[PDB]
Amino acid sequence: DDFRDPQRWKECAKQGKMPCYFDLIEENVYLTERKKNKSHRDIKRMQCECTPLSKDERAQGEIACGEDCLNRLLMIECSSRCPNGDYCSNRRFQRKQHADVEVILTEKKGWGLRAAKDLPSNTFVLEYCGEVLDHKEFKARVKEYARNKNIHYYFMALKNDEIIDATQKGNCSRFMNHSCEPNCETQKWTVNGQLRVGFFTTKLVPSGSELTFDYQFQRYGKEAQKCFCGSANCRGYLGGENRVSIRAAGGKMKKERSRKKDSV
DNA sequence: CCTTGGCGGTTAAAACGCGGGGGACAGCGCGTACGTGCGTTTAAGCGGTGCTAGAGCTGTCTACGACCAATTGAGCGGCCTCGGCACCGGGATTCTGA
């Protein structure tokens, strides 16, 4: 049903059976990246405190860096300098250990995902990957794109000044829907000094059940949208009722201390 | 000189049982204090240029302490001396508990 092939095919827009109208994407890309960060001055290395054995697996064998590691509890994946080396299990964004996903049609609200097999809680599913914008381009491209009459906006605010677009290029995590009864959620992990957004499960999801995540509600123009799930209390509407501004939607830029002019 | 050791008697003391009240403990609903997040503002550090107070390094020389002889009286001790205080008793007053 997914069938990732590099040849472009005859499916217009819905991307349900032919995924090669747009392009896919690996770990995200940047535009104006400069060397002003906490990367390699104080977060050079954050090594866990573990005294392993690593010579007894498959018999009296505890998995390395489980839920007692200092980094997993604080949402940090280990580096290559781990005392376990190539047996540590924290590095899940680097070894690309994913979950079995599939994209078919469930409801007329749109496309989504349904679980293939059983999946336990606190299990990683997919990484949100896209194109990283910057301060000036967001408020221009959004008003340039609102006049194109599109339904889906693939914008996610990483920080108060960073918004990731998953429209031109997107992985399999772009189809996941919204519901007022969430069973998956989003977490902010720190890998190699850079912040990444991942998807974790919360319960024991049966084989053949929905996998959606809760939106932190937001609206951007004058119109409103509504959800079609209706689990038991569903808030009716994507984005709620309350209106917020262009800057509040994106997070309003950390103003370069120039001038006042930019606020006006 | 006084420490370790010994036998012996007195009775203050520690250990043992019991009743049952004191409080240590798990559990719950609730209110808001402190957090994650985030725009705007203050002023913390840089570096550059400049002045100079005050630390630092040469020279004097006499005020000050160490040392020495002779003198002798102040402080440590031995020995009686005697009264401030504990000990014991009869009694009135405080305080706790049901």
Side-chain angles (χ1 to χ4, degrees), chain A residues 6-236:
Chain A
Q7 292 83 14
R8 59 184 183 270
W9 285 347
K10 297 178 179 179
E11 197 280 330
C12 294
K14 304 304 288 302
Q15 300 299 107
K17 274 78 70 176
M18 298 181 181
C20 194
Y21 184 75
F22 289 161
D23 293 331
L24 77 161
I25 194 166
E26 205 64 24
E27 187 265 338
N28 55 6
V29 71
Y30 297 96
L31 296 175
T32 58
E33 190 275 335
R34 73 278 190 185
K35 65 271 198 187
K36 184 63 161 62
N37 202 5
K38 78 273 291 181
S39 297
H40 295 285
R41 185 172 293 172
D42 56 350
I43 314 298
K44 299 182 265 72
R45 66 179 185 273
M46 296 184 69
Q47 296 297 324
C48 59
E49 184 177 0
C50 294
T51 60
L53 185 63
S54 186
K55 298 285 103 173
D56 293 331
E57 288 81 2
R58 295 183 182 88
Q60 291 185 356
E62 182 69 24
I63 53 95
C65 283
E67 60 184 3
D68 292 330
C69 179
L70 294 175
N71 292 320
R72 190 178 293 273
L73 294 174
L74 303 171
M75 299 174 66
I76 296 169
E77 292 190 356
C78 297
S79 67
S80 65
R81 300 290 300 163
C82 171
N84 287 316
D86 292 330
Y87 293 98
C88 181
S89 62
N90 294 117
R91 291 180 286 109
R92 289 179 292 177
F93 289 178
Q94 298 176 356
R95 293 182 176 274
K96 304 296 291 179
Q97 294 179 355
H98 295 173
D100 295 329
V101 296
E102 57 88 17
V103 178
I104 57 172
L105 184 62
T106 63
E107 191 67 20
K108 290 188 290 184
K109 185 266 294 305
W111 294 91
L113 280 76
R114 193 171 67 244
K117 64 178 68 177
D118 191 0
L119 198 57
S121 179
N122 296 120
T123 311
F124 174 65
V125 179
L126 287 173
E127 181 181 3
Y128 182 79
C129 297
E131 295 177 355
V132 178
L133 272 76
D134 64 348
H135 307 100
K136 181 66 175 179
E137 291 179 354
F138 174 73
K139 60 185 290 182
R141 285 296 299 272
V142 60
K143 69 180 288 295
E144 184 177 2
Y145 193 74
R147 62 179 177 88
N148 290 323
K149 280 79 175 178
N150 190 10
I151 298 170
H152 303 281
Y153 289 173
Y154 299 94
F155 286 151
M156 180 180 285
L158 180 67
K159 298 209 292 275
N160 60 326
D161 56 352
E162 301 294 330
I163 299 91
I164 301 170
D165 176 75
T167 304
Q168 295 177 355
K169 293 182 178 178
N171 55 9
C172 294
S173 64
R174 65 186 293 273
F175 295 100
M176 195 165 290
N177 296 117
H178 171 78
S179 179
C180 285
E181 184 182 2
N183 53 4
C184 294
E185 68 181 358
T186 50
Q187 286 191 3
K188 294 184 286 165
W189 282 80
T190 303
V191 176
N192 294 324
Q194 294 179 356
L195 185 63
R196 296 178 178 179
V197 178
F199 286 96
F200 282 0
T201 61
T202 59
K203 291 186 289 295
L204 269 293
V205 176
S207 171
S209 181
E210 294 294 332
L211 292 174
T212 60
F213 71 99
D214 191 3
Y215 287 174
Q216 290 299 123
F217 62 89
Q218 191 87 14
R219 70 160 76 216
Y220 189 93
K222 286 181 271 75
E223 65 280 10
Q225 293 181 355
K226 78 281 290 179
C227 189
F228 291 159
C229 70
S231 294
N233 52 8
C234 158
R235 298 160 270 188

